[PDB]
From a paper:
We designed six variants with the standard phylogenetic strategy (encoding 20–37 mutations from WT; designs WHT2476–WHT2481) and three with the ProteinMPNN-based PSSMs that exhibited fewer mutations (17–26; designs WHT2482, WHT2483, and WHT2484). To determine whether the designs retained the structure of the parental protein, we determined the crystal structures of WHT2483 and WHT2484 (19 and 26 mutations, respectively) to 2.4 Å and 1.9 Å resolution, respectively. The biggest divergence in the backbones occurs at the C-terminal portions of the α5 and α7 helices with up to 1.7 Å difference in position at His464 in the α7 helix in WHT2484. The main surface change is the reduction in positive charge in a patch on both WHT2483 and WHT2484 compared to the parental construct due to the introduction of the charge-swap mutation Arg418Glu. This is reflected in the overall reduction in the calculated pI from 9.2 for parent to 8.9 and 8.8 for WHT2483 and WHT2484, respectively. Comparison of the binding footprints of the human antibody panel with the mutations introduced in WHT2483 and WHT2484 reveals that the binding surfaces are largely conserved, with few of the introduced mutations being within the antibody bound surface of parental PvRBP2b169-470. There are three introduced mutations which fall within the antibody binding footprints, these are Lys248Leu and Met324Phe which are present in WHT2484, as well as Gln378Leu which is present in both WHT2483 and WHT2484. These mutations fall within the binding footprints of human mAbs 237235, 283284, and 241242, respectively. Despite the presence of these mutations, these human mAbs still bound with nanomolar affinities to the stabilized designs. Recognition may be retained for Lys248 and Met324 as the contacts are solely mediated by van der Waals interactions with the sidechains, which could either be retained by the residue swap or are long range (>5.0 Å).
Residue numbers in the entry: 30 to 329
């Protein structure tokens, strides 16, 4: 097999509000529930959030993983097609045309991504329910007009330190190197299709390049999302430092920095996975080009 996992497929719901990943915890919103555990431990009135987290948040997370796993049968079928399409030797030892296999790939890709969303729809509703319960729990803060913002500000300072650990410049360097090499390969295959008589090898390379393009798009999408999250929290740190605020304001403060930090934490893992997926595709492309040039040498 040329490809052993397809963790790089993701899907958003129709409202574009939630993004579902195959990587646990599957939604960045779960990391928000995790960050709120940290905020609540500094407010005596809401320390009971720890019991909400260990019951409702843990159950939601395990329900999310269960939903993802319901789609494993479609995933395995899709992996089977991918491995025929990427591998000329496997294509030559079956009898479906390359065009029929490509159409089946498109159908199974959308059925698999659709399963990831469909089986998680009730989980998305439960995110909204737990968010609402957190908003209600915050009512128990004693303050009303005079809520202190020191915990909020302290966590912004922590987040800025955490942001420095992320290889953000290296990710820019990587996706640029990779996009440029991708576009070079695409242009190169377009020339080879006229100079080299090897449609079995060329069609497989073209397919792998098509996959690489999908994964590049995902990388760029998640990279823009985490840069936006860092920029938003950085602008808070660079802006007017609050004094005391109303309880309603403090709720929104924690939801804002908790959700953007959750986006950052979730993007870390998603980008690392997509970087690995792109390196894996590079390996496959180069080995296919080895075959292409070796066949060309043989035909002189």
């Amino acid at each position: 097999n040329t490809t052993d996992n397809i963790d790089y497929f993701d899907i958003s719901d129709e409202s574009n509000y939630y993004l579902i990943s195959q990587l646990r915890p599957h939604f960045s919103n779960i990391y928000f529930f995790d960050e709120f555990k940290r905020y609540a431990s500094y407010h005596t009135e809401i320390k009971r959030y720890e019991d909400i987290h260990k019951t409702k948040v843990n159950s939601l997370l395990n329900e999310a993983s269960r939903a993802i796993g319901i789609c494993n049968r479609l995933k395995n079928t899709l992996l089977g097609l991918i491995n025929i399409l990427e591998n000329p030797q496997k294509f030559k030892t079956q009898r479906e045309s390359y065009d029929v296999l490509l159409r089946q790939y498109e159908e199974k890709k959308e059925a698999f991504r659709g399963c990831l969303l469909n089986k998680n729809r009730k989980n998305l509703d439960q995110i909204k329910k737990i968010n609402n319960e957190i908003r209600d729990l915050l009512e128990r803060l004693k303050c009303s007009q005079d809520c202190q913002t020191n915990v909020y500000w302290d966590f912004i300072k922590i987040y800025l330190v955490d942001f420095k650990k992320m290889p953000l410049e290296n990710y820019d360097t990587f996706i640029k190197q990779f996009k440029n090499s991708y576009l070079s390969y695409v242009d190169l295959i377009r020339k080879y299709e006229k100079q080299i008589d090897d449609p079995i090898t060329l069609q497989a390379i073209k397919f792998v390049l098509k996959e690489m393009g999908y994964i590049i798009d995902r990388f760029e999408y998640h990279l823009q999302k985490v840069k936006h999250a860092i920029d938003q929290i950085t602008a808070i740190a660079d802006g007017v430092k609050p004094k005391q605020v109303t309880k309603n304001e403090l709720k929104e403060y924690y939801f804002n920095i908790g959700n953007y930090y959750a986006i950052f934490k979730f993007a870390k893992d998603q980008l690392n996975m997509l970087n690995k997926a792109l390196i894996h595709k590079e390996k496959i492309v180069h080995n296919l080009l080895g075959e292409l040039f070796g066949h060309l040498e043989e035909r002189i």
